[PDB]
Structure formats: C-alpha cells, structure tokens
Design a protein around this nucleic acid. Structure first.
Lengths: 89, 90, 78, 79, 83
DNA sequence: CCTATCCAATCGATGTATATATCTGACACGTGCCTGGAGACTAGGGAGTAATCCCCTTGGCGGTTAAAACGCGGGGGACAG
DNA sequence: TGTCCCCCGCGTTTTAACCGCCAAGGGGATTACTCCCTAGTCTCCAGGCACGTGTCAGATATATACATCGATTGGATAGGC
C-alpha cells in the first residue's frame, strides 16, 4: 500500500493519535509545572493540544521529507527531523 | 455574545443554498477576531508613530494596505472606502 | 506513559505528511519532539490559568499558549 | 538595471562569512534573486508608513518598523 | 577556507553602499528621499539575512555529503522558513 | 514418420460507480428578555493647518586607491554506475 | 570505483567606492490658533441573543456487482528427405 495509504489519510480529516494516551501524556507533563498537584483538563483543551500537536508533527514530517529527497534518499532519517528543527528558529 | 450569526447572514449572502456545521462557524468565529486583532493592532501602532491619539479611516486603511497582500489589500480598500462614504453622507 | 504514542500512530502521522519508508528510532525521535513541544505549550498554558486563581486549563489557555509559541489554533475559541 | 550592483566578490564575501567553502555559479545570481524579493518586501512596508504620514523623507524608523512587521527586528537605529 | 575565518572575525559591510543605495531606490520608485541612516538600516539587515541564509543553506549542503552550494540549497532553506 | 510450425485456453486478481436511506442527534429557526445598540447635548482637548527655522541630503568635482574584473593551470569535488 | 569538470589562486588591469569639501533649499519640526467630533452621560429601543425542539445534512455498514485482460503449453499439421 505504497500508492494506496498515501492518498487515504490526506483525504481523511479526523485524528490520528488516540485521545486517552495523549491526555495521559498531557497530564503527566502538566504535573511537572504545577509543583506536584493533580489538575483538571477540559475536554476542549485536550483536543486543542491534540489538534495542535498532530498538525505540528505532520508539518515537521512534510518539511523533512523534502530533506530526505535532497540527499537522494526515500528513507526518512532523524537527521532530517533535527535539521528541520534548525532552519525554523 | 459572538460574531457567529453576523458571519451567517453574510454566509446567506454568498451561499444561500449551502449549509454549514458548528465547527466551521466557530473557526469563522475565530477568523474575524483573528484579523481584527491584526488590523486594529497595526492601526494602534500607526497613529502612535505620527503622534496621533485617535484612529480615523486612514489608520485602518493603512493597516489593511500593510497587512493584507496586494490583491486582497486593494479589494478590501475598495470594500472599505465605500462604507465610510455611505455612512457619513447617509 | 510516553509509549502511549504507538508505532502505527507515528506511521499514520508520517503517512499524512507523505513519508514512504518510516524508519526505526524515528519513532523515538517523534515522541521526543512531542515531549519538547507539549511541554512548551503546557508551561505557558497553566501560567495563564494560575493568574486568575484557577485550577483548570480551558481551551482559551491552550490558544494563548499556542499564540505565544507562534502558531494560531482556530477551532477551539470559546 | 541595478541588480548587477551586487557583484560576485560581494556575494563571495557574503558566502565566505556564512561558512561556505566552494560557491557555485548560480549563487552569484541567486543572491541577486533573493535580494530582489526580500528587499522589496522591506521597501513597500517602509514606504506605506511614509504614505501614512505627510512626508517624502523615508527615515530609518520606517525601515525598522517594516523589519518589525516582517519579523526580524533591527538594533542600533531607534534614537 | 582562507577568508572564512577573516570575515567571521570582522564586522564591516561586505556590500558597498552606493550600488545597494541605487538598488533600494530602484524599488523605491515602484511604490522620494532616503536618509543615510535609512540606507544603513536597509543594508545591515539584508547583509545579515544573506549571511544567515547561506549559513542555514550550508546545513543542507553537508546533509547530502556535498561541500558545494547549489540552486536547490537556497530554495529548500526558504521553504521550511515560509518566506 | 520425426520434426518445426499456427492456436488458444486455462490461472488468477484488482480495481470504484452511485445504490442507498437507516441508527443517532445537532443546525435552522421561532420565541422572548434585554443589555447592549443607538440618537443626542456639551464642554474641550486633540486634529488640521498656515508661518518660519534650519537642517540635512540631494547635487556635484576632484585624488589615488583599495576593490572589482579577467584568463590560465589544474585538482579534488559531484555525481554516474 | 571513477572519470568530468568548476571554481580557486595568482598575475595583471581598471572603473568606480570613498573621502574632502562647498551648497542650499526640500521639508520635518515647532508655535499658535481655531474648530471637528468624539467621549461622558442619559434615556431609549430593538436586533441578538439563550431555550427549546423539527427534522433534515450527513456517515457509515458493507453485499459483492463489474467484464474481460496478461500469459503458457499440448494437440493438429504441412513440408523433408
């Protein structure tokens, strides 16, 4: 499904990361900057973080796949994801 | 209160046959104040540079001309310079 | 808790971005960046809700933190 | 045609300051490309402020305000 | 490799004033009077933008193994920047 | 009668068109409360604008001089396999 | 591995940047005055907004339709010596 799976998720519009592990990760990050206390997270506030992070990750991947073909590669590498986090500031 | 139904009637202007969900309205409800904060923002600096403590139509016009791109800025000027005339004279 | 971001999830994420061959430690490179990003939004977003003497980050506190980060989220404004 | 005022040794100094060992051939024109498309976005955004006030003298203040609008602030020209 | 360590330690302007002044005033008539302080404000930011763009495009150079710049180097750096 | 020469027949897989209306539950809108939209006096402090200063950048001629430009040898880099 | 070649350095040449210096009024800024018109306040007054429900815009569930098209081997078969 090289030519099949590329044209399905871009036509689709829903989420790709699951809601509950993302919410658990967001709470595990939120307890760091709250001096170690439990914290309430609204249902809109978690989906906002999810919609932001998914869009940011697909933008970082589509800005690194152009660096993949720059070296004559079709295989994505972490050298492309660390170079895309350098020409952004 | 919100801009939403004010978005809807204009939505009835350009597309009466086309409906909408509440999400795309809300983005619309997050669109206008996204540009408002721009155009009233840039006009907050424009009058400050020429030592003015008021905002006329020229400050908003200059903020539109500075913020919007070339074909969009001229089209909003021609849509903006007609509403200052039909409000004062009528 | 960092392994909640599964392997076909990052695969689908890179597939949305249009990546044919998704590598190995890339899967550990993503959740690392997801640890870098999600911290930087949450460190600001609870800073907004602690000024109003509140214990709940709303959607607007996420929008303000993202507007501080440099990307404006639209569809969560209340 | 003042795009040739940016000469090949000037572009060479700009590349050698950026850590370039071996400059290619089109880079001596590509600079003349990007300095034609960057600076124009600095010019009009600096003249509209001049078109905002009643003046014909485009000060450095209009330049640094245009560079603030584009997103790269400049030091050493405020007061 | 010789003058690379010469201009990085220096601070003077690489592009001359009057060709840059004529190039700026060629764009100025497309939309006056230019102060000598405004020409330096136009030239310093543009030179520091050019050096930084070349520095960021040289990271695209040593990603493919190359050491020589290319036309695809200045068109891929501004793609991620959104300019 | 051995042999080279036309024939086809079995093996199998890989795609969307527009075909629907059916299990839930949210958009358009009627109604109504009202709080913000809106007309209007009134003092007044900012907007607009003439006169003048004097400033500073346009305008220009000359000196010699560092910087720009041009042609050849070649040697390690770019990219093809 | 491997051969094609593109700028780099250097000897040589030269046109324009920069400095030195006089000029001189375009016009930015400042003074002062006079008048827009908009904020404060106030009563008013009316589209725009929550409550509530009528029902229609849409989003799967998924049965399996849809007809040939790419290719290989065994059996007849006309000519040879």
């Amino acid at each position: 499904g090289w030519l099949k799976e590329i044209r399905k998720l871009q036509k689709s519009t829903h989420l790709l990361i699951r809601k509950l592990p993302f919410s658990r990760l967001a709470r595990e990050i939120c307890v760091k900057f709250t001096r170690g206390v439990d914290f309430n997270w609204q249902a809109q506030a978690l989906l906002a973080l999810q919609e932001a992070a998914e869009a940011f990750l697909v933008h970082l991947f589509e800005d690194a796949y152009l660096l993949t073909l720059h070296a004559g590669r079709v295989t994505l590498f972490p050298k492309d994801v660390q170079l895309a986090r350098r020409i952004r500031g | 209160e919100s801009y939403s139904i004010y978005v809807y009637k204009v939505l009835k202007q350009v597309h009466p046959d086309t409906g909408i969900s509440s999400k795309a309205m809300g983005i619309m409800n997050s669109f206008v104040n996204d540009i408002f904060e721009r155009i009233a923002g840039e006009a907050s600096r424009l009058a400050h540079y020429n030592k003015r403590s008021t905002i006329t139509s020229r400050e908003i016009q200059t903020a539109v001309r500075l913020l919007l791109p070339g074909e969009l800025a001229k089209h909003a000027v021609s849509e903006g310079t007609k509403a200052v005339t039909k409000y004062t004279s009528a | 808790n960092i392994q909640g971001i599964t392997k076909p999830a990052i695969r689908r994420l890179a597939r949305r971005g249009g990546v044919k061959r998704i590598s190995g430690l890339i899967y550990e490179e993503t959740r690392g960046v997801l640890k870098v990003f999600l911290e930087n939004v949450i460190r600001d977003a609870v800073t907004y809700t602690e000024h109003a003497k509140r214990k709940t980050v709303t959607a607007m506190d996420v929008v303000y933190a993202l507007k501080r980060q440099g990307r404006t989220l639209y569809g969560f404004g209340g």
